[PDB]
Design a binder for this molecule. Structure first.
Ligand code: SQY
Ligand code: CL
Ligand code: CL
Ligand code: CL
Ligand code: CL
Ligand code: CL
Ligand code: CL
Length: 337
Protein backbone atom coordinates (compact mmCIF):
# COMPACT_ATOMS: atom_id res chain seq x y z
CA UNK A 1 0.00 0.00 0.00
CA UNK A 2 1.41 3.39 -1.02
CA UNK A 3 1.56 6.40 1.26
CA UNK A 4 -1.33 8.83 0.70
CA UNK A 5 -1.42 12.60 1.24
CA UNK A 6 -4.37 15.00 1.60
CA UNK A 7 -5.16 18.41 0.16
CA UNK A 8 -8.20 20.61 -0.41
CA UNK A 9 -8.55 21.92 -3.98
CA UNK A 10 -11.47 24.29 -4.69
CA UNK A 11 -13.54 22.95 -1.77
CA UNK A 12 -12.69 19.34 -2.72
CA UNK A 13 -10.69 17.01 -0.48
CA UNK A 14 -8.26 14.84 -2.47
CA UNK A 15 -6.38 11.97 -0.82
CA UNK A 16 -3.99 10.38 -3.35
CA UNK A 17 -0.72 8.38 -3.47
CA UNK A 18 2.56 10.33 -3.30
CA UNK A 19 3.36 9.29 -6.88
CA UNK A 20 0.83 11.91 -8.11
CA UNK A 21 2.15 15.51 -7.87
CA UNK A 22 1.24 19.09 -8.82
CA UNK A 23 -2.53 18.54 -8.88
CA UNK A 24 -4.51 21.28 -10.69
CA UNK A 25 -8.32 21.44 -11.06
CA UNK A 26 -9.50 21.11 -14.66
CA UNK A 27 -14.29 16.45 -10.14
CA UNK A 28 -11.18 16.16 -12.35
CA UNK A 29 -7.57 17.28 -11.77
CA UNK A 30 -4.46 17.26 -13.94
CA UNK A 31 -1.27 15.88 -12.37
CA UNK A 32 2.22 14.52 -13.04
CA UNK A 33 2.72 10.79 -12.43
CA UNK A 34 6.26 10.20 -11.13
CA UNK A 35 6.08 6.44 -11.74
CA UNK A 36 5.22 6.49 -15.48
CA UNK A 37 6.39 10.01 -16.40
CA UNK A 38 3.00 10.84 -17.98
CA UNK A 39 0.83 13.85 -17.43
CA UNK A 40 -2.44 12.31 -16.21
CA UNK A 41 -6.10 13.11 -15.59
CA UNK A 42 -7.45 12.00 -12.17
CA UNK A 43 -11.24 11.78 -11.72
CA UNK A 44 -12.76 11.55 -8.22
CA UNK A 45 -16.23 10.01 -8.32
CA UNK A 46 -19.07 11.97 -6.72
CA UNK A 47 -21.31 9.99 -4.33
CA UNK A 48 -20.63 6.66 -6.06
CA UNK A 49 -22.90 4.51 -3.80
CA UNK A 50 -25.83 6.85 -3.01
CA UNK A 51 -28.51 4.62 -4.59
CA UNK A 52 -28.83 1.22 -6.25
CA UNK A 53 -28.80 2.96 -9.65
CA UNK A 54 -25.66 4.93 -8.78
CA UNK A 55 -23.81 1.98 -7.21
CA UNK A 56 -24.49 -0.13 -10.33
CA UNK A 57 -23.41 2.74 -12.59
CA UNK A 58 -20.11 3.00 -10.70
CA UNK A 59 -19.51 -0.75 -11.12
CA UNK A 60 -20.38 -0.54 -14.85
CA UNK A 61 -17.90 2.29 -15.49
CA UNK A 62 -15.04 0.56 -13.66
CA UNK A 63 -15.68 -2.77 -15.45
CA UNK A 64 -15.62 -1.05 -18.86
CA UNK A 65 -12.49 1.06 -18.23
CA UNK A 66 -10.63 -2.01 -16.88
CA UNK A 67 -11.41 -3.94 -20.08
CA UNK A 68 -10.30 -1.42 -22.75
CA UNK A 69 -6.70 -1.93 -23.97
CA UNK A 70 -6.33 -0.27 -27.41
CA UNK A 71 -4.34 2.67 -28.81
CA UNK A 72 -7.52 4.47 -30.04
CA UNK A 73 -9.65 3.98 -26.88
CA UNK A 74 -9.39 5.46 -23.37
CA UNK A 75 -7.60 3.09 -20.99
CA UNK A 76 -6.98 2.85 -17.25
CA UNK A 77 -3.52 3.67 -15.88
CA UNK A 78 -4.59 3.28 -12.22
CA UNK A 79 -7.57 3.05 -9.86
CA UNK A 80 -7.32 3.58 -6.10
CA UNK A 81 -9.13 4.28 -2.80
CA UNK A 82 -7.58 5.59 0.44
CA UNK A 83 -9.74 3.07 2.37
CA UNK A 84 -7.96 0.21 4.12
CA UNK A 85 -11.05 -2.03 4.45
CA UNK A 86 -14.41 -2.65 2.82
CA UNK A 87 -16.16 -1.17 5.89
CA UNK A 88 -14.63 2.30 5.42
CA UNK A 89 -14.72 2.19 1.60
CA UNK A 90 -16.47 5.23 0.13
CA UNK A 91 -14.34 7.01 -2.49
CA UNK A 92 -13.12 5.91 -5.93
CA UNK A 93 -10.41 7.64 -8.02
CA UNK A 94 -9.67 6.85 -11.72
CA UNK A 95 -6.48 7.75 -13.67
CA UNK A 96 -5.76 8.02 -17.42
CA UNK A 97 -3.40 9.87 -19.79
CA UNK A 98 -4.09 13.60 -19.94
CA UNK A 99 -5.52 14.68 -23.29
CA UNK A 100 -5.19 18.28 -24.39
CA UNK A 101 -8.11 18.87 -26.74
CA UNK A 102 -11.14 17.34 -28.42
CA UNK A 103 -12.09 17.18 -32.08
CA UNK A 104 -13.99 20.51 -31.85
CA UNK A 105 -10.92 22.39 -30.60
CA UNK A 106 -9.00 21.20 -33.66
CA UNK A 107 -11.95 21.59 -36.07
CA UNK A 108 -8.34 23.93 -42.43
CA UNK A 109 -8.59 20.13 -42.69
CA UNK A 110 -7.31 18.48 -45.85
CA UNK A 111 -8.65 15.22 -47.25
CA UNK A 112 -5.52 13.53 -45.85
CA UNK A 113 -6.51 14.72 -42.37
CA UNK A 114 -10.07 13.35 -42.72
CA UNK A 115 -8.70 9.99 -43.89
CA UNK A 116 -6.44 9.65 -40.85
CA UNK A 117 -8.98 10.85 -38.25
CA UNK A 118 -11.85 8.62 -39.46
CA UNK A 119 -9.48 5.64 -39.89
CA UNK A 120 -8.56 5.86 -36.19
CA UNK A 121 -12.22 6.10 -35.07
CA UNK A 122 -13.04 2.98 -37.13
CA UNK A 123 -9.98 1.08 -35.81
CA UNK A 124 -11.09 1.75 -32.23
CA UNK A 125 -14.69 0.82 -33.09
CA UNK A 126 -13.68 -2.52 -34.62
CA UNK A 127 -12.07 -3.30 -31.24
CA UNK A 128 -15.04 -2.10 -29.14
CA UNK A 129 -17.61 -3.92 -31.29
CA UNK A 130 -15.64 -7.19 -31.22
CA UNK A 131 -16.35 -7.35 -27.47
CA UNK A 132 -20.10 -6.74 -28.06
CA UNK A 133 -19.87 -3.25 -26.54
CA UNK A 134 -21.89 -0.35 -28.02
CA UNK A 135 -20.61 3.20 -27.43
CA UNK A 136 -23.99 4.93 -28.18
CA UNK A 137 -22.73 8.54 -27.79
CA UNK A 138 -20.06 9.16 -30.44
CA UNK A 139 -19.75 12.90 -31.19
CA UNK A 140 -16.84 15.36 -31.63
CA UNK A 141 -16.71 16.31 -27.92
CA UNK A 142 -16.10 12.62 -27.05
CA UNK A 143 -13.00 12.28 -29.29
CA UNK A 144 -9.61 13.40 -27.94
CA UNK A 145 -6.97 14.55 -30.47
CA UNK A 146 -3.32 15.64 -30.08
CA UNK A 147 -0.86 17.78 -32.07
CA UNK A 148 0.20 14.77 -34.20
CA UNK A 149 -3.46 14.10 -35.22
CA UNK A 150 -3.64 10.99 -32.98
CA UNK A 151 -7.12 10.22 -31.65
CA UNK A 152 -8.85 8.35 -28.80
CA UNK A 153 -12.51 7.47 -28.15
CA UNK A 154 -13.72 8.31 -24.64
CA UNK A 155 -16.85 8.95 -22.54
CA UNK A 156 -18.79 5.79 -23.34
CA UNK A 157 -22.56 5.87 -23.00
CA UNK A 158 -23.19 4.50 -19.52
CA UNK A 159 -28.68 10.90 -20.90
CA UNK A 160 -31.93 12.52 -19.76
CA UNK A 161 -34.96 13.67 -21.75
CA UNK A 162 -34.28 17.36 -21.11
CA UNK A 163 -30.70 16.81 -22.31
CA UNK A 164 -31.89 15.71 -25.78
CA UNK A 165 -34.52 18.45 -26.27
CA UNK A 166 -34.33 21.27 -28.82
CA UNK A 167 -31.38 22.68 -30.81
CA UNK A 168 -28.67 20.57 -29.14
CA UNK A 169 -25.52 18.74 -30.30
CA UNK A 170 -26.36 15.99 -27.78
CA UNK A 171 -28.89 14.67 -30.40
CA UNK A 172 -27.46 15.67 -33.83
CA UNK A 173 -25.23 12.56 -34.14
CA UNK A 174 -27.82 9.98 -32.97
CA UNK A 175 -29.16 7.28 -35.29
CA UNK A 176 -32.87 7.79 -36.07
CA UNK A 177 -33.97 4.39 -34.70
CA UNK A 178 -32.61 5.30 -31.23
CA UNK A 179 -33.61 8.99 -31.35
CA UNK A 180 -37.28 7.96 -31.75
CA UNK A 181 -37.22 4.54 -30.00
CA UNK A 182 -38.22 2.69 -33.20
CA UNK A 183 -36.76 -0.69 -32.25
CA UNK A 184 -34.17 -2.59 -30.28
CA UNK A 185 -30.89 -1.11 -31.51
CA UNK A 186 -27.45 -2.66 -31.85
CA UNK A 187 -23.86 -1.69 -32.64
CA UNK A 188 -24.80 -0.23 -36.06
CA UNK A 189 -25.98 2.97 -34.30
CA UNK A 190 -22.28 3.87 -33.89
CA UNK A 191 -21.64 3.70 -37.66
CA UNK A 192 -24.41 6.27 -38.24
CA UNK A 193 -22.59 8.61 -35.83
CA UNK A 194 -19.28 8.13 -37.68
CA UNK A 195 -21.00 9.15 -40.95
CA UNK A 196 -22.29 12.36 -39.35
CA UNK A 197 -18.79 13.18 -37.99
CA UNK A 198 -17.09 12.45 -41.34
CA UNK A 199 -19.54 14.69 -43.27
CA UNK A 200 -18.86 17.56 -40.83
CA UNK A 201 -15.06 17.25 -41.16
CA UNK A 202 -15.45 17.41 -44.97
CA UNK A 203 -17.88 20.38 -45.14
CA UNK A 204 -17.27 22.35 -41.95
CA UNK A 205 -21.03 22.19 -41.16
CA UNK A 206 -23.22 20.02 -38.91
CA UNK A 207 -24.97 17.44 -41.10
CA UNK A 208 -28.38 17.21 -39.32
CA UNK A 209 -28.68 20.28 -36.98
CA UNK A 210 -32.34 19.79 -36.09
CA UNK A 211 -34.24 22.26 -33.89
CA UNK A 212 -36.11 19.29 -32.26
CA UNK A 213 -36.58 15.51 -32.81
CA UNK A 214 -39.12 15.99 -35.65
CA UNK A 215 -37.23 18.71 -37.53
CA UNK A 216 -34.14 16.46 -37.32
CA UNK A 217 -36.04 13.47 -38.74
CA UNK A 218 -37.21 15.61 -41.68
CA UNK A 219 -33.60 16.64 -42.43
CA UNK A 220 -32.50 12.97 -42.33
CA UNK A 221 -35.28 11.68 -44.63
CA UNK A 222 -34.64 14.46 -47.18
CA UNK A 223 -31.08 13.14 -47.65
CA UNK A 224 -31.53 9.36 -47.38
CA UNK A 225 -35.16 9.00 -48.55
CA UNK A 226 -38.34 7.86 -46.78
CA UNK A 227 -38.60 4.23 -45.58
CA UNK A 228 -39.81 1.38 -47.74
CA UNK A 229 -42.09 -1.46 -46.66
CA UNK A 230 -39.13 -3.65 -45.65
CA UNK A 231 -37.90 -1.24 -42.96
CA UNK A 232 -41.42 -0.21 -41.91
CA UNK A 233 -42.09 -3.82 -40.83
CA UNK A 234 -39.12 -3.60 -38.45
CA UNK A 235 -40.48 -0.59 -36.51
CA UNK A 236 -42.16 -2.14 -33.46
CA UNK A 237 -44.13 0.93 -32.38
CA UNK A 238 -47.43 1.03 -34.26
CA UNK A 239 -47.50 4.71 -33.28
CA UNK A 240 -44.19 5.59 -34.96
CA UNK A 241 -45.19 3.49 -38.00
CA UNK A 242 -48.37 5.55 -38.43
CA UNK A 243 -46.42 8.82 -38.16
CA UNK A 244 -43.84 7.78 -40.79
CA UNK A 245 -46.65 6.78 -43.16
CA UNK A 246 -48.16 10.27 -42.86
CA UNK A 247 -45.11 11.85 -44.58
CA UNK A 248 -44.96 12.37 -48.35
CA UNK A 249 -42.51 9.96 -49.95
CA UNK A 250 -39.02 11.20 -50.94
CA UNK A 251 -36.21 9.55 -52.96
CA UNK A 252 -32.62 9.32 -51.77
CA UNK A 253 -30.56 12.33 -52.92
CA UNK A 254 -27.39 12.26 -55.05
CA UNK A 255 -24.53 12.50 -52.51
CA UNK A 256 -22.09 13.79 -55.17
CA UNK A 257 -24.33 16.88 -55.50
CA UNK A 258 -24.57 17.28 -51.71
CA UNK A 259 -20.85 16.90 -50.88
CA UNK A 260 -19.64 18.99 -53.81
CA UNK A 261 -15.96 18.60 -54.63
CA UNK A 262 -15.23 15.86 -52.09
CA UNK A 263 -13.03 12.87 -52.88
CA UNK A 264 -15.32 10.41 -54.74
CA UNK A 265 -14.11 7.60 -52.49
CA UNK A 266 -15.25 9.59 -49.44
CA UNK A 267 -18.65 10.14 -51.09
CA UNK A 268 -18.93 6.38 -51.69
CA UNK A 269 -18.11 5.56 -48.05
CA UNK A 270 -20.68 8.08 -46.73
CA UNK A 271 -23.37 6.42 -48.86
CA UNK A 272 -22.54 3.10 -47.19
CA UNK A 273 -22.61 4.48 -43.62
CA UNK A 274 -25.69 6.73 -43.84
CA UNK A 275 -28.26 4.02 -44.64
CA UNK A 276 -31.65 4.32 -42.95
CA UNK A 277 -32.11 0.53 -42.40
CA UNK A 278 -29.52 -0.33 -39.76
CA UNK A 279 -29.27 -3.97 -40.99
CA UNK A 280 -27.70 -2.69 -44.24
CA UNK A 281 -25.05 -0.27 -42.93
CA UNK A 282 -21.36 -1.06 -43.48
CA UNK A 283 -19.64 -2.52 -40.38
CA UNK A 284 -16.43 -1.12 -38.86
CA UNK A 285 -14.35 -4.12 -40.01
CA UNK A 286 -15.74 -3.80 -43.55
CA UNK A 287 -15.10 -0.02 -43.68
CA UNK A 288 -11.42 -0.38 -42.70
CA UNK A 289 -10.95 -2.34 -45.96
CA UNK A 290 -12.57 0.44 -48.07
CA UNK A 291 -10.34 2.07 -50.72
CA UNK A 292 -10.62 5.49 -49.02
CA UNK A 293 -8.19 4.21 -46.32
CA UNK A 294 -5.64 2.54 -48.64
CA UNK A 295 -2.81 4.73 -47.29
CA UNK A 296 -3.37 3.55 -43.67
CA UNK A 297 -5.09 0.13 -43.66
CA UNK A 298 -2.99 -2.73 -42.25
CA UNK A 299 -4.96 -5.92 -41.50
CA UNK A 300 -2.12 -7.20 -39.28
CA UNK A 301 -2.34 -4.11 -37.03
CA UNK A 302 -6.11 -3.76 -36.46
CA UNK A 303 -6.64 -5.83 -33.31
CA UNK A 304 -9.78 -7.27 -31.72
CA UNK A 305 -10.71 -7.44 -28.02
CA UNK A 306 -10.83 -10.18 -25.41
CA UNK A 307 -14.44 -11.24 -24.67
CA UNK A 308 -16.43 -9.05 -22.24
CA UNK A 309 -18.95 -10.62 -19.81
CA UNK A 310 -21.91 -8.25 -19.30
CA UNK A 311 -24.16 -10.71 -17.45
CA UNK A 312 -24.21 -8.34 -14.44
CA UNK A 313 -26.48 -5.96 -16.40
CA UNK A 314 -29.46 -8.28 -15.89
CA UNK A 315 -28.66 -8.88 -12.18
CA UNK A 316 -30.68 -7.41 -9.28
CA UNK A 317 -28.51 -6.62 -6.23
CA UNK A 318 -28.61 -4.41 -3.15
CA UNK A 319 -26.44 -1.30 -2.72
CA UNK A 320 -23.88 -3.01 -0.50
CA UNK A 321 -23.59 -5.95 -2.92
CA UNK A 322 -22.80 -3.60 -5.83
CA UNK A 323 -20.37 -1.77 -3.51
CA UNK A 324 -18.58 -4.99 -2.54
CA UNK A 325 -18.20 -5.98 -6.20
CA UNK A 326 -16.72 -2.55 -6.92
CA UNK A 327 -14.24 -2.87 -4.03
CA UNK A 328 -13.11 -6.26 -5.38
CA UNK A 329 -12.41 -4.74 -8.82
CA UNK A 330 -10.45 -1.85 -7.26
CA UNK A 331 -8.10 -4.07 -5.25
CA UNK A 332 -7.61 -6.61 -8.09
CA UNK A 333 -6.40 -4.00 -10.64
CA UNK A 334 -3.10 -4.84 -12.35
CA UNK A 335 -1.47 -1.90 -14.16
CA UNK A 336 -0.32 -1.98 -17.79
CA UNK A 337 3.39 -2.63 -18.60
C1 SQY B 1 -13.98 14.96 -21.58
O1 SQY B 1 -13.23 13.91 -21.00
C2 SQY B 1 -12.81 14.09 -19.72
O2 SQY B 1 -13.09 15.12 -19.14
C3 SQY B 1 -12.02 12.93 -19.14
C4 SQY B 1 -12.23 12.74 -17.62
C5 SQY B 1 -11.69 11.41 -17.16
C6 SQY B 1 -10.53 11.33 -16.38
C7 SQY B 1 -10.03 10.07 -16.01
C8 SQY B 1 -10.71 8.95 -16.46
BR1 SQY B 1 -9.96 7.18 -16.17
C9 SQY B 1 -11.87 9.01 -17.21
C10 SQY B 1 -12.36 10.25 -17.56
C11 SQY B 1 -10.58 13.23 -19.48
C12 SQY B 1 -9.74 12.23 -19.99
C13 SQY B 1 -8.44 12.57 -20.35
N1 SQY B 1 -7.93 13.82 -20.25
C14 SQY B 1 -8.74 14.77 -19.75
C15 SQY B 1 -10.07 14.52 -19.35
CL1 CL C 1 3.08 6.39 -4.27
CL1 CL D 1 -12.57 5.80 1.06
CL1 CL E 1 -20.04 17.50 -29.85
CL1 CL F 1 -29.64 15.28 -55.38
CL1 CL G 1 -17.98 -10.79 -26.03
CL1 CL H 1 -15.22 -10.18 -18.86
Amino acid sequence: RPTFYRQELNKTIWEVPERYQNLSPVSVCAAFDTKTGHRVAVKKLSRPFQSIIHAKRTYRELRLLKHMKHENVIGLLDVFTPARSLEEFNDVYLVTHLMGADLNNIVKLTDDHVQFLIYQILRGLKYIHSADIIHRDLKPSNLAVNEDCELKILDFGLHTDDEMTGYVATRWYRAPEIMLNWMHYNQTVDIWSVGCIMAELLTGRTLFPGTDHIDQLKLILRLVGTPGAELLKKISSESARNYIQSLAQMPKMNFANVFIGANPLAVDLLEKMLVLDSDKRITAAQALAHAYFAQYHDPDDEPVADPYDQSFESRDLLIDEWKSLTYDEVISFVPPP
